[PDB]
């Protein structure tokens, strides 16, 4: 408002065209994403199959920042909508399924989703 300001990520001086967009609306900052999937790969103990589902989920959760249990049903429906093409093309359809049954053991989702999700996936595969 009467002072020279600086970008916090580069310390370069912030010019008049302004502090408009925040340099930290990074709900999921880039490096956290890579850091997460790098850590999954470092596991010698876990499939190549169940990893590629874990990575995708994590990236998905981090992008929307779900924080309630009451959001997990919508999260899984969102997951397949947005990620289903990948799950199919990379041949991860069963592992995904182990993910939904797990998510169910953790009491986060209902049985009605744990297949309403498997339904919309297949529904998508045929679309190819």
């Amino acid at each position: 408002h009467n002072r020279l300001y600086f970008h916090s990520d580069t310390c370069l001086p912030l010019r008049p065209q302004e502090m408009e967009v925040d340099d930290e609306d990074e709900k999921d900052p880039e490096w956290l994403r890579e850091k997460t999937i790098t850590q999954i790969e470092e596991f010698s103990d876990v499939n190549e199959g169940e990893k590629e589902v874990m990575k995708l989920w994590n990236l998905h959760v981090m992008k929307h920042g779900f924080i309630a249990d009451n959001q997990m049903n919508h999260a899984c429906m969102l997951f397949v909508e947005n990620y289903g093409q990948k799950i199919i093309k990379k041949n991860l359809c069963r592992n995904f399924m182990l993910h939904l049954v797990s998510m169910h053991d953790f009491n986060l989702i209902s049985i009605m989703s744990i297949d309403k999700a498997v339904t919309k996936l297949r529904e998508m595969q045929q679309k190819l």
Binding site: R3, M19, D22, E24, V46, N47, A68, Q71
Partner: protein, 463 residues
Amino acid sequence: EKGPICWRKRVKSEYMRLRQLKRFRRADEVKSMFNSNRQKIQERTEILNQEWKQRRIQPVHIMRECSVTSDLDFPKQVIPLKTLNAVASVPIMYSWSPLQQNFMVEDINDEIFVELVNALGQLDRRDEKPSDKIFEAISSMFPDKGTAEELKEKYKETPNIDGPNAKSVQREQSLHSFHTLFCRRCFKYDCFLHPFHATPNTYKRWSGAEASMFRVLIGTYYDNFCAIARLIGTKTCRQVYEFRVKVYNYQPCDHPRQPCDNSCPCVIAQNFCEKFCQCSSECQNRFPGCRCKAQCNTKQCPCYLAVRECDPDLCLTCGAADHWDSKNVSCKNCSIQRGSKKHLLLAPSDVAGWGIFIKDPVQKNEFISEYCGEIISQDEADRRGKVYDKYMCSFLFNLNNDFVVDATRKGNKIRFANHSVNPNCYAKVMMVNGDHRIGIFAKRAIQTGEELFFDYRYSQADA
């Protein structure tokens, strides 16, 4: 059969042979690569040198005073000393990574052994003109690499299901990775906040591909094989039916068939049970939530009074559990969990160093930002604190008895708020869906552009 002393000598001889062998076949690899690397040198050096030919760069010429002397009797030279016009520098800053939530951080080879064993073996064969005296001789020259036993063992020397190698497996073994690596608390695998792996009770409420998926799905669907059919995909009501026949940090408690009394970890830590605990849904020590209709920022509301944010799974009525797409909601007590921080600006402080300025007016007691960083143990803080003292300077802040948050390597902008005993901000540690987090609040109304300060001393007193 042929003498222990004899064999030990052979051990010593073959090993010394092999070694010396690898040594040469390895001096050559080096030699090979030094050469075929130097071919690369000249190959790419030419490329540059040619790109250099195609240029006509200007020669440099000559011009308060400066001189240079010679220690080999050459005549001293004197030339004009031009001044470079001043340029202002910005305060010191060490590299750091952006965070919007806290991040936890914790505090004779085998190749040759086998060749030697084999080489020793072939002598035992040529002898008669994986033996047992051989391993005892090797353990005698290498008592360290293991005993006669361990060496016989060392010598001889996680499914996937979507693949070509799926097995028929237990259901709690196809699910194993998902069950141990999943955080019920933040819905992510191998999460960045929660070290203690998930409680055992928290994850309980024909080819490999088909058989395994069968046992997994019955543990969830049980006997409705109609559905188990739909999901296993390529089987049927029948076929399935037939296959069948043939202040302390919070940590979820799990003490099966036993009440949360004075032996309970939560009760001893003086913490409430949360929705994450594996205890009676009727547990007396669980925190209820609040039935407020809005606001939630006065001692009237039990959450605010308890110094907790509202829980989006218990506070059904105030607004905390809805409108996920907005950050401004009916409820005024969930700014941290939704990360509804205020715009902050970075500039050199008017006191020293770097400071942080608020971009828009904020009201007394209003949330400004969470103070984020690495979560480390009291032990790691000790180590780190020795290093930090060299700098007369530190950004560790206690979270509770167990953890410190350190904005040194990771954090968000509010870490540029300077210290003062006359602050316009204060720090309050809230319980937030089972995590202690640090929120920074305005202590008085604050206007556009004002520099932010809070009193570090209160953080520094986990006295």
